[PDB]
């Protein structure tokens, strides 16, 4: 797997119905009708949590929609019950996504009587399953690329929303996984992979080298920023650092490779060789250091063929001087990706079980 | 003696049809329209042959530049308000909104 995805967080089963039923029975003490409707909704919601977060999930759209629907539904009932006045006896227990190390500290599992905590962990699971569905996709198929682009940008924006909102209505320190720095880095990683998908779509369609170079160069920035962040404080699984380092260098090489083709077409034979030499040294670093995590053989050969043929033609025919890298026009950047904002509802055919209350 | 903004409009439009600026725009537009949730409009654009699609997207971008800049001279200050006035009316025209957003980005570079 060259693409990073995130494991879903684990949670204990909760009787979500019991305290909502009790509140309904106290609000509508004579209302046979209202008790029957909203208590049924409360039992439906408790089944929905069990379906969304209480079991392992297949990497299918139907499982993500269940998750998305659960997130919408708990956002919808927040005002309709006194969660705010701490008068609903509900504790949610969640386990850090990143199950590594000794166990030491005491925060593998964290229990909080907080709907805000529940919201953050559920949205984390939405992001995580989105990252997994995206990473399952066949990127040699056009619909796989479309799904991957949508799901990476969703995951990016869901992880960002958690970063902007998690500390508020959490009281004490979160588990590390949902901490603002952890989800911030995850957000960037997903955006980088989203931009990589657009670069692979452009490659698959044999679009002009100029845009491909620019798509790859934007991906380099994203992977470079993710990698810088994940160096500082590394909390993530051990494969993330070397994959981001690899993809940072690979995407700079792709940018230089495709720019080199445009330099050739424009008869700038010296720049072609200058850029192909940069591509090659970047791919030498990757092969050398990130051998375990990415396979760059076919790319490395392509570069070396193009470089050999360029230098023969230039030495015999063109005699173009090979520019220093510093004197090259910077490659542009084409941004095709954004962190998709979280605006409830994010599920498909969303009906609030407590619409009527 | 053309208004300053009218000249810059015609200069930008020229680059869309004859220049590399245009080639990038129609490749950016095809990738955004490719990526978005399918509408009959988006499906139709995608089914077109490259040459036909390139031309349609240039012509649509022209229409939106001419719409966004169609001002007196005072609207060329606070151009972001033109985005605010127009964008909300395109929520049910997702192709047109995508093209309008790129036209606004192009237009902003010159007028700011």
From Swiss-Prot, chain A:
May be phosphorylated on tyrosine residues by activated PDGFRB. Residues 2-357 form the BRO1 domain. It is found in: Cytoplasm, Cytosol; Melanosome; Cytoplasm, Cytoskeleton, Microtubule organizing center, Centrosome; Secreted, Extracellular exosome. The modification N6-acetyllysine is found at residue 214. Changing residue 211 to D: Does not support cytokinesis; loss of normal midbody formation; loss of CHMP4A-, CHMP4B- and CHMP4C-binding in a yeast two-hybrid assay; impairs rescue of PTAP-type L domain-deficient HIV-1 p6; no effect on localization to the midbody. The modification N-acetylalanine is found at residue 1. Disulfide bonds: none annotated. It is linked to Microcephaly 29, primary, autosomal recessive: A form of microcephaly, a disease defined as a head circumference more than 3 standard deviations below the age, sex and ethnically matched mean. Brain weight is markedly reduced and the cerebral cortex is disproportionately small. MCPH29 is characterized by small head circumference apparent at birth and associated with global developmental delay, impaired intellectual development, speech delay, and behavioral abnormalities. Affected individuals also have poor overall growth with short stature, mild dysmorphic facial features, and seizures. Self-associates. Interacts with SH3KBP1/CIN85. Interacts with PDCD6 in a calcium -dependent manner. Interacts with TSG101 in a calcium-dependent manner; PDCD6IP homooligomerization may be required for TSG101-binding. Interacts with SGSM3. Directly interacts with CHMP4A, CHMP4B and CHMP4C. Directly interacts with CEP55 in a 1:2 stoechiometry. The interaction with CEP55 is required for PDCD6IP targeting to the midbody. May interact with PDGFRB. Interacts with SH3GL1 and SH3GL2/endophilin-1. Forms a complex with SDCBP and SDC2. Found in a complex with F-actin, TJP1/ZO-1 and PARD3. (Microbial infection) Interacts with HIV-1 p6. Interacts with HIV-1 p9. Multifunctional protein involved in endocytosis, multivesicular body biogenesis, membrane repair, cytokinesis, apoptosis and maintenance of tight junction integrity. Class E VPS protein involved in concentration and sorting of cargo proteins of the multivesicular body (MVB) for incorporation into intralumenal vesicles (ILVs) that are generated by invagination and scission from the limiting membrane of the endosome. Binds to the phospholipid lysobisphosphatidic acid (LBPA) which is abundant in MVBs internal membranes. (Microbial infection) Involved in HIV-1 virus budding. Can replace TSG101 it its role of supporting HIV-1 release; this function requires the interaction with CHMP4B. The ESCRT machinery also functions in topologically equivalent membrane fission events, such as enveloped virus budding (HIV-1 and other lentiviruses). This is Programmed cell death 6-interacting protein. It comes from Homo sapiens (Human). The chain holds residues 2 to 358 of 868 of the full protein.
